[PDB]
Amino acid sequence: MATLTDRSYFPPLGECLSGNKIILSWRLVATALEDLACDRLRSAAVSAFLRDGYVHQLLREPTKTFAPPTNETKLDFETKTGAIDPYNLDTIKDDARWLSRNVNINEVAALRVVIIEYQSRAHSHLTGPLSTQDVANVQEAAGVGDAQASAIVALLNVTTVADADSAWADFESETTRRRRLLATYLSERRSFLAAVDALLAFLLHSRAPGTGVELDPLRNAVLQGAFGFDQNAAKPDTTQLDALAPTYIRTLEGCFDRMQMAPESLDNQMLTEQFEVDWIRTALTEAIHAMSLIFQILDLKASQFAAPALVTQWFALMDTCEFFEPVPRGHELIAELLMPLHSLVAAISLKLLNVDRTLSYLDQDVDLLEEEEPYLASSDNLAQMHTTIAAAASAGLISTMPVVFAWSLILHQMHVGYQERAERRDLLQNQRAQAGFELGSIVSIEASSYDVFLVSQQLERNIEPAENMARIATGRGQVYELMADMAVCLGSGQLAAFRPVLGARARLTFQDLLKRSAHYVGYQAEPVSCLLSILSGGSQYWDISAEAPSNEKSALDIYTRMLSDDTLNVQYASQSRNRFPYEFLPFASMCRILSAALVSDNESSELITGLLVKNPSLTLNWDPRWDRSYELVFEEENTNSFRLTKDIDLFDAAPEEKCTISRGTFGRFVTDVGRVAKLEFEHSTLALFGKRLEVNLMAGAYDTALGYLSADELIEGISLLATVLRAETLRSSKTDPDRGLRILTEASRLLSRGRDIMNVVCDTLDSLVEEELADLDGPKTAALSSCLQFLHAALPVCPGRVWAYMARCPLINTDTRSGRLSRITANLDMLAERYDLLLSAVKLFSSLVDSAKTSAVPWIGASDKIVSRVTLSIAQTSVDVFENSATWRFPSEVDRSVMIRDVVGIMHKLMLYTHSVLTGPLAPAADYVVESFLSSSSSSLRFQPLLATLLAAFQLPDTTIYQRRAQIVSERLTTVLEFATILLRVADYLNKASAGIQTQLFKSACVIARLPAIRHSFRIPAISLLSALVESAGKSSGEPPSLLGYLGPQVSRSFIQIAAQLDKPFDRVAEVASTWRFFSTILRNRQQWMANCLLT
């Protein structure tokens, strides 16, 4: 009746051991809730799991899940297994009781883990180290006289030593099985908290962009069932959701304890080096996902004081855990979790301090809501929080510097409030003094709710401690650089650790700190730069999207607040405009960042674009040759106000294309330390920059009042142009197109000779690259990126112009006699700006071949002739890059993964689009790629990057954060695998090749077949490839190479098992079809050994 049953979460043992019921482990549940995940969340298994009342109890009270053993659970453990070929019930029983004793969980929970391990042994086999023979195969597939070094470092890391026969002897041992049990347990712990975190993100974010987002029935079902939250109710009860925060805060003390010691109840020599890392990694991961949850809950009541009990609970925790700073940090797995952990710690602390509402409340400038109560109301609260934050500031714990900084402001404001009331009181004391010395009431001070705390620390008469905290944090504490890093971590770029939604709401705390510190700090280089970083969040031009972070409206607050918030807008945003273009970077950076981020919000985009087109002022260096073209308007003694008596032209010859500012326009000099003037001249920033751009080309044929724009201003200015063009493009409709068109002509509204901004950027591009033919300069190399990005953005609005220019674009046009300039200029080195340049080219090339597919359905500059040489050069360059990537040194492996995915993608699209455009315009390009890979003159060297992807994928860390990193490696793998399949097909299709490329894939089959046990998204592309391999071998005139032969007996048994386990867990139609395709081709292509293995 009342007692919620365990049976749905833990099926009867018999149905598990048989294979009927596959237990939904937390790992699978977690994967079903991953950032991409959508289809998996629909499946009946997961739907039932999330709708289970028993599961709901674990969600509210996480200590239940792996709760300590009791006689109540010992009893259930006997009952659970008194219901029942030997899978050895006694071995399973032995293990469950061993596990329960070693990590001190209850026998039922241990039994759950034991079965999970048992039902995933096939996966365990494949994730183990390769056999020695397998390594020999990879080595031979690589086979280079020099580039085997990069192959060697990869093989060394794949972990190598095994004779397959004894590997099974190891695997079956009692020791090895129980290490797997510990690892399965640690895996389940990580996944449990990851699941809870991801579940809340799923519930609290309606209208997410998943597949068929009427996942609302599931959302509503869980909300009402687990948290009593009825959205359709009059006033929804949130007390249960709220209760999650104090609950999960409690779990954090545990994570911190475990992070310091393994349970002294665990058998020795389970304690390998591998186990210690896994143990620590789990504790940290649990901490990170709990904190993510806590934040989501706090953010439910944002713009409002948290409950004081919540505020003090958190800071008491930070006190006992020393702000989560002392952690054992040896391995890399542990290392990449530190920044995310610290980011959440800072953000949560800031969220709870709520520096913005706190300062406003102290100035009696805010009215509390019904049940709102600030922690400031109590001196006792403040006393506890103070010593904690002060201790962090004294120890110089780096990650806590934002908290120290925010607190120093709060302290100062309390001190000011006290001094004000003290003077107000001492004034009355002196009025009554005066009236008394003519020819008895001892007037006291106005009472505050924080005074007795102030006195206890002497902060009422001595504010030096607060000043010093700010000094520590801005100085040696490097809080500005620190927040910039946390903003990348909490960003929306490829290095981001968290969901964009969470990150966007968290970065908000950092922005509030800068909003308030601007009162004490001016408009200085550091806070400004930091603010730009917090806004940027590590994004770039390629990340620009037509949609908001998970379609969330409030996720864009951090961006929209730059407009709507009086302090940020006046102190930062409008402040940057008031000094543009005299100071170019900040204003230009900010418009680029905001417009890129605000694409989905029309009212915000119009305000930013409108400002660029209708800009009220202009700030520049005063030309001393204008000392008679102005009269002082008056007051004070004015270095300030003046009025232009004559007209002044910003641009002079040595034409009606000039920038003149009519007389009467008012101005103001802005330094007295220099000669800078702010002119109230309304104008178009874009139109102006376009003309500045044009002047820079003519090399002294013009005069500029604005000066020659430098390399940095060249980079920033074009990127802004690119971004704004791109943004306006994505906002355009079929009822309102030509938005990008308008932006192009608005920027071309001031040029000469019937010339466009298009021509200016293209001429800039060509001129730059002859200047960049010197090749030593990064800033110029970066400017090349911007030109390419503009060209990319310009492609959708005027395709023909871009194609027409690419024909003469010196970067590629190998053309007449190998005039390939991008290759020479990029190859020289492969770091920093060079990578960005090469990426921009690749990305632009990819859009070009995309343009040919939609051209087969304004366009005037595109002819078959031109499209053929352009795409041929692209193919030529793509192959060159792809091949060279083997030896190159990229900034990071994530960066390499982007490069490889996009370069291989280009070549894949060339072969795939050749038939839908007689040879055909894409034919020579497609032929170039085909001939490049089929010729064994270099095929034995042109396979290495393919294998590198294979091994990179095989070594993707097991993490539930850094999902964007995992999506990217997955896209690199998938793209390479699918490219390999198209190669095999085309090779068979024209009967050439077969030979080496097919052979190399067989040599690589040992790695390929292990992929499906690394990630779900790997499964279908890997299997699909092996099927294409088997089908190709069946088309060879002799007897096809045995696939079972290469993989070995045991690996094959495990692989085939998984192809059946592929069908099972989520019931996806696609998974079933790939197993069917694989088995069908095995049975039809003379792989008898594999065929028989299929049935055993």
Author numbering: 1 to 84, 92 to 446, 460 to 674, 683 to 885, 903 to 962, 971 to 1149
Which text from the study accompanies this structure?
Nucleocytoplasmic transport across the nuclear envelope is controlled and facilitated by nuclear pore complexes (NPCs), very large, modular protein assemblies. The Nic96 complex organizes four architectural proteins, Nic96, Nup157/170, Nup188, and Nup192, as well as the more disordered protein Nup53/59. Nup188 is a stacked helical protein with intrinsic flexibility. Moreover, we can show that both Nup188 and Nup192 specifically bind to FG-repeats and translocate across NPCs by facilitated diffusion.
The N-terminal fragment (Nup188N) includes residues 1–1160 and its structure was solved to 2.65 Å resolution. Nup188N crystallized in space group C21 with one copy per asymmetric unit. Nup188N is built from 52 stacked helices. They fold into a large right-handed superhelical ring that resembles a lock washer. We can discern an inner ring of helices forming the concave surface and an outer ring of helices forming the convex surface creating three distinct subdomains. Between helix α32 and α33, we find a β-stranded insertion with structural homology to Src-homology (SH3) domains. The Nup188N ring structure is closed by four helices (α10–α13) from subdomain I that latch onto a complementary surface created by helices α44, α46 and α47. In total, the latch covers an 1511 Å2 interface. In contrast to canonical SH3 domains, the SH3-like domain in Nup188 has a different β-strand topology, which represents a circular permutation. The most regular part of Nup188N is subdomain III, which was found to be structurally similar to nuclear transport receptors (NTRs).
